[PDB]
Design a protein around this ligand. Sequence first.
Ligand SMILES: *[C@@H]1O[C@H](CO)[C@@H](O)[C@H](O)[C@H]1NC(C)=O
Ligand SMILES: *[C@@H]1O[C@H](CO)[C@@H](O)[C@H](O)[C@H]1NC(C)=O
Ligand SMILES: *[C@@H]1O[C@H](CO)[C@@H](O)[C@H](O)[C@H]1NC(C)=O
Ligand SMILES: *[C@@H]1O[C@H](CO)[C@@H](O)[C@H](O)[C@H]1NC(C)=O
Ligand SMILES: *[C@@H]1O[C@H](CO)[C@@H](O)[C@H](O)[C@H]1NC(C)=O
Ligand SMILES: *[C@@H]1O[C@H](CO)[C@@H](O)[C@H](O)[C@H]1NC(C)=O
Ligand SMILES: *[C@@H]1O[C@H](CO)[C@@H](O)[C@H](O)[C@H]1NC(C)=O
Ligand SMILES: *[C@@H]1O[C@H](CO)[C@@H](O)[C@H](O)[C@H]1NC(C)=O
Ligand SMILES: OC[C@H]1O[C@@H](O)[C@H](O)[C@@H](O)[C@H]1O
Ligand SMILES: OC[C@H]1O[C@@H](O)[C@H](O)[C@@H](O)[C@H]1O
Ligand SMILES: [Cl-]
Ligand SMILES: [Cl-]
Lengths: 602, 605
Amino acid sequence: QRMFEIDYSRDSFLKDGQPFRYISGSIHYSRVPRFYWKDRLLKMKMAGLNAIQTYVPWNFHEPWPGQYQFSEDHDVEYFLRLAHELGLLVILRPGPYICAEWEMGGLPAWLLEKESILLRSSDPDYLAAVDKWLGVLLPKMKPLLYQNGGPVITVQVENEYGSYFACDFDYLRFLQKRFRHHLGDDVVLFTTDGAHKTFLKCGALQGLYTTVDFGTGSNITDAFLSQRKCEPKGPLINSEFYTGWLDHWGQPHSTIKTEAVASSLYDILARGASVNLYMFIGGTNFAYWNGANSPYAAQPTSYDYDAPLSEAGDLTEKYFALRNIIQKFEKVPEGPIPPSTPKFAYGKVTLEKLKTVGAALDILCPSGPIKSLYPLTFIQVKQHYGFVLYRTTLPQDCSNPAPLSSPLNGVHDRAYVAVDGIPQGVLERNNVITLNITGKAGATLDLLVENMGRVNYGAYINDFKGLVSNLTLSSNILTDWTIFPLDTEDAVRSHLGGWNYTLPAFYMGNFSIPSGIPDLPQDTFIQFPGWTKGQVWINGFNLGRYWPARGPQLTLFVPQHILMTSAPNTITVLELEWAPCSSDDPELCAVTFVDRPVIGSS
Amino acid sequence: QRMFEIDYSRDSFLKDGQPFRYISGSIHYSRVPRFYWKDRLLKMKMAGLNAIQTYVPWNFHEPWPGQYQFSEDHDVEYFLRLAHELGLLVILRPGPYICAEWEMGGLPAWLLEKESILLRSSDPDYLAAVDKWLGVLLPKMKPLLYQNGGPVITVQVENEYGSYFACDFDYLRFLQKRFRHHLGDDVVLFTTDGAHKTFLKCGALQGLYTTVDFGTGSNITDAFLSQRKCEPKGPLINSEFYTGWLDHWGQPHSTIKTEAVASSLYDILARGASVNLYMFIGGTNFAYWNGANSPYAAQPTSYDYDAPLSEAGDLTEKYFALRNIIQKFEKVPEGPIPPSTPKFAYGKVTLEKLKTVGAALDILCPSGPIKSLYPLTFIQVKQHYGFVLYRTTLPQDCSNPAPLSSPLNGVHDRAYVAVDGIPQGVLERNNVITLNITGKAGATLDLLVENMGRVNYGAYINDFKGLVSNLTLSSNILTDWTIFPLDTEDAVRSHLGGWGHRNYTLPAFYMGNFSIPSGIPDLPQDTFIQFPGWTKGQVWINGFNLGRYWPARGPQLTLFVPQHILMTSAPNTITVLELEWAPCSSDDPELCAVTFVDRPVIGSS
Ligand SMILES: *[C@@H]1O[C@H](CO)[C@@H](O)[C@H](O)[C@H]1NC(C)=O
Ligand SMILES: *[C@@H]1O[C@H](CO)[C@@H](O)[C@H](O)[C@H]1NC(C)=O
Ligand SMILES: *[C@@H]1O[C@H](CO)[C@@H](O)[C@H](O)[C@H]1NC(C)=O
Ligand SMILES: *[C@@H]1O[C@H](CO)[C@@H](O)[C@H](O)[C@H]1NC(C)=O
Ligand SMILES: *[C@@H]1O[C@H](CO)[C@@H](O)[C@H](O)[C@H]1NC(C)=O
Ligand SMILES: *[C@@H]1O[C@H](CO)[C@@H](O)[C@H](O)[C@H]1NC(C)=O
Ligand SMILES: *[C@@H]1O[C@H](CO)[C@@H](O)[C@H](O)[C@H]1NC(C)=O
Ligand SMILES: *[C@@H]1O[C@H](CO)[C@@H](O)[C@H](O)[C@H]1NC(C)=O
Ligand SMILES: OC[C@H]1O[C@@H](O)[C@H](O)[C@@H](O)[C@H]1O
Ligand SMILES: OC[C@H]1O[C@@H](O)[C@H](O)[C@@H](O)[C@H]1O
Ligand SMILES: [Cl-]
Ligand SMILES: [Cl-]
């Protein structure tokens, strides 16, 4: 019955034998709570989009080999059926690498158990893992294909492979074969690359439809000319037309002017091109899901992106401007649009110190530490995200400051250093590779090391994390390590089993919200004035990382569905550098909930 | 064990042996959907109030003798428990007359089945009905008394009886005896009257603690001196400190400046007086619950009152100002205040004419009409609220216009007139008692008569409604009437029978639907419905009577729509009964429409 094809004669798609052009927006289901999926998708439909595009992050669904997450917030099949329900078609981008400002570009960290693995290549072990994953993911996607009665009209193979150094065409051919095996011969498969011959050279493949991406700064004629060199016939397609841009901690918040996005969008549509707006809603990197760029710079918790729908799904002036552009080409749905959610300022909530990390090792590491002559990486100790404690003893007296150093810049990515429970400061990847320390001979030297997010783009995506090379004290290699993987997520859920720098520590407090009030709880934004850098949970849900010391993001988005009215709400903060809690004023040791986000602080 | 008493020695209340004074606000549960009771009550607590005050409208709970309504939106017992659960005390004002800009001051219209009844007196038939009501209501209130473990700390007897002409002290003694019988000998019983000896003369009674009321334009010293003449000892009390004032259709919206309310409130509290703010939230007169004053002027649907909480429960600058003054005397609760609800503009919804009233008679009046030589009142035909159709035949040719009159001014309160399906205009209490009509001899003369609300204050609360006296045509009395009481609420809920039973236009029902998406956390939201191009009528959404609209008079243009009556996926049905002129004749379907907006307009020019 149902057909979706490239017709090479009208330089067009044909949907059920009819000319069809898609106007799509990116929404990542892994970046929006399922609680809000229908809200965001309906707002997208009301803007006049006839499709949405999404990434399937492999690491979000296969945390360990043969252990799968496809329920609740991880229910990609439900997300796709919901789009279909709403009358939206779907452009699926299952990777296996997705880039996406996401931890290791979507690639599971357990791949790095083979230390020499060449990711995104014909490396047999990488291929074998990909094949197993595709064997689980793609039969799920097959019934969701358009010709089988679902919304999925096209499927991207890999992601900007032309930008990667390997240029392994056999790898692309493998993916083509395997996608065809599972999905059949009719599904439109495609690739996306930068709009230049240099990018297309290694990214394009025979039998995969070549598309390009570009934002508001690109010459649109030249960009499509570059696509046309690869595909003389067929639809013009811009698969990632940038509505904004990504951020890094410590760098000014990225914005793109509404007038520029509207002007380029109109230009692209008027050409008869299919287009996807990246991002339409950006949402949030909750927990440890953010990625990084090289030279090492992590992206923040917010993935607001300056997108047409704000992080919390708000209707922006950019949203209405783009909807007005779409309306010049297509009739958009009638009726009022679902509103921006109400936001509530719950106000100040005092916290109290629970325990330092150092005092909580029984709860954080209930299996006991691993001993090693030299330091081991996160992967070697079977921990992918969060924090690992490295412990040794001082081999000499350090009454005078002694250089603690990682000569090969092997602190990936940041270490909070203490000696006999006295904080010494911080080692930082690419920035501070030496720190002067003091303490007695035999004193306990602790390094709490944070994985700040695995690099998601470029050659250095094989990003192990931890102490990846030796530390020296006064030029001498430090040996005899006691390494504690830290079960932070379990420990926070159990209130740590109790069911200038400060020592890394957990602080906790409670706030209640009244029941029987129709419009509470509401969404809110948590702010950390006086704090420095850490992690935050509300009711055990890891909301991500805060860093008001660096910016530009000051507030974190808190979705209302994790807040309750039946029992008090708990807030737990892991502060890594300096807590405003040593003062004799308990009111200082506190967080604040505000009703407007601050993501563009200077 | 718990105690609440007047300490006469020390001019105070005692609560469990401790000095106490109350800072209360009025909330009428009959004017707030139950969906929102906890919301309003919590905002009230967060303002620093330690008590709320409320009226029990008798007619709201006993629509016919022995038929009672105490469930859902009528659940007084629950409202009082909810207040108690929030840590609020209650000043209960059970009447039996409450005034309150409410239909007939709370008294049931069926009292008027005795035409000569003297309301609010020792009239035996009045007392018998009062006694039966008290014997149902008061035993429900007994466990809610403070000394039995509930919130109720004081109870008002009657309501400003000193303003009424009768001065029947037997009546007051009878209430006192009956309240004591049911509630016991400890409950503080009190009266409230205007702060002047001319009011207190007939309102105050031995054994009932005399309190006064006054607003921002009163001298506080003089007002409390007037109280002290009646109660030399005991707490100073202002039982109705006015934060705003009532409205009437066609008059500008009443406001009172925030600074005036704040300053007077400060001065009252500084005297150590207990005080209740009337109203703290006013809410809404849904359906036909509004009252009227004399000379006849009905209060509108909105009871916003310019109160510190707006009709939809919003936090206003007045709210925060009053909270700030209360904080100067007492500690106010910690924590953020529940917010003003979100409002959503659902936009324009087109309607279309379903049926005229005349075409829907069989569904509105399924038991048939009552025939009578001369017209009968609402009360006589056993209808209390809404609309009754009076029908006769023209006895003379009226090819030339002939005067239809109510010589004794007895159209109570408005009649929409038609002859053989052609609208002739409107007869109006006081204003227009004659209308020229045309039609052939034997033509059907219809008058659709609306009860615009029974007067709630003054001598004239015995307000029957309907054609209360004869009609004349060219000076000759019109005889032989066929009178149709109209079950509009039943008929609207069944879509004029379409869902089964499991310049002027003819009065008619206009319907339209709109949908709200499901699975959206923040929809449905509260909204406000506006009627541009419409004239006068009644409005329902999903069978819930939201009240009366009258953009032709104002000041209320919009009507408050609470979100809980709206539904997702399934279409919401709006029914408009337009009485005078609908914007629905022209070939432009777009004009026959209502509009939902996100801001109220109750104070338009
Ligand atoms: C884009 O490049 C083309 C030539 O390929 C040139 O003609 C045109 O002016 C350029 N457009 C813009 C907006 O710069
Ligand atoms: C540490 O101390 C030594 C001697 O005071 C000094 O030369 C060196 O610059 C210091 N290094 C750091 C990294 O602070
Ligand atoms: C540390 O140093 C030892 C001895 O020089 C060497 O064998 C080892 O490879 C180093 N280990 C790491 C993780 O750098
Ligand atoms: C906070 O709430 C938790 C559970 O939500 C409870 O077990 C604990 O006793 C409370 N602690 C404080 C300090 O309020
Ligand atoms: C109110 O009346 C008293 C006399 O009872 C007088 O002293 C006072 O000046 C008056 N207050 C005002 C504000 O006029
Ligand atoms: C009724 O008609 C007469 C003419 O017969 C006219 O004098 C009178 O003013 C009219 N009355 C009304 C109420 O229009
Ligand atoms: C109508 O007129 C008759 C005859 O004068 C009179 O007896 C009757 O009481 C009047 N009825 C009303 C309802 O005014
Ligand atoms: C309004 O909706 C109800 C239920 O679906 C239906 O009975 C009625 O016919 C509807 N009217 C229109 C015009 O859709
Ligand atoms: O936000 C920048 C974007 O850049 C693209 O080149 C890439 O395909 C996306 O996944 C994303 O990283
Ligand atoms: O809003 C004006 C008020 O006037 C008072 O005199 C009366 O007791 C109240 O019930 C109410 O009518
Ligand atoms: Cl995407
Ligand atoms: Cl009251």
